[PDB]
């Protein structure tokens, strides 16, 4: 459904190239997260099959109040907004990582990504 589809749009990029600052600034614009500029957004890479499986016990475990945490690790890239304005141009700093992720599932589909685990304040 629509929520799973939207999840894939702001949080999934199967095969990115260099996961650098330029990559971030480009995929953020591409996925329309630049008006206003999202403060931080993480993309998961890899195959969708593994992401959907986090909703089942095959690749996930219950987490906190109503989330699921993946068993396998995923390659990810977090784009963090740099600068004092929430309006384009949006400059982003990229951080490539590799760990498990936390999502919320709806009818067996990931519909939300808990991005808190990617922001080290």
Place of tokens 């699921």: 68
Question: With the CA atoms of 13, 5, 57 and 14 taken in that order, what torsion angle do they form, in degrees rounded to the nearest 10?
Answer: -10
CB-CB contact of 43 with 9 (8 Å): no
How would DSSP label each residue in the chain? -HHHHHHHHHHB-SS-S--SHHHHHHHHHHTT-BTTBPSEEEEE-S-HHHHHGGGSTTSEEEETTTEEEESS-EEEEEEEEESS-SSSS-EEEEEEEEE--EEEEETTEEEEE-GGGG---
Binding-site sequence positions for tRNA: 19-20, 79, 101
> What does this entry list as its resolution, in Å?
2.0
Q: Give the technique used to solve this structure.
A: X-ray
Q: Where are the domains of the chain?
A: 1-121
Peptide bond into 62 cis (omega under 30): no
Which residues are catalytically annotated?
A: 11, 112
CATH superfamily of 1-121: Ribonuclease A-like domain (3.10.130.10)
């Amino acid at each position: 459904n629509s929520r799973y589809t939207h999840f894939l749009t702001q949080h999934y990029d199967a095969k990115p190239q260099g996961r650098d600052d330029r990559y971030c600034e480009s995929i953020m614009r591409r996925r329309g997260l630049t008006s206003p500029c999202k403060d931080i957004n993480t993309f998961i890479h890899g195959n969708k099959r593994s992401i959907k499986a986090i909703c089942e016990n095959k690749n996930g475990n219950p987490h906190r109040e109503n989330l699921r945490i993946s068993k396998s690790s995923f390659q990810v890239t977090t784009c963090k907004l740099h600068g004092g304005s929430p309006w384009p141009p949006c400059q982003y700093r990229a951080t490539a990582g590799f760990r498990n992720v936390v999502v919320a599932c709806e009818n067996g589909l990931p519909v939300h990504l808990d991005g808190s685990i990617f922001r080290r304040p």
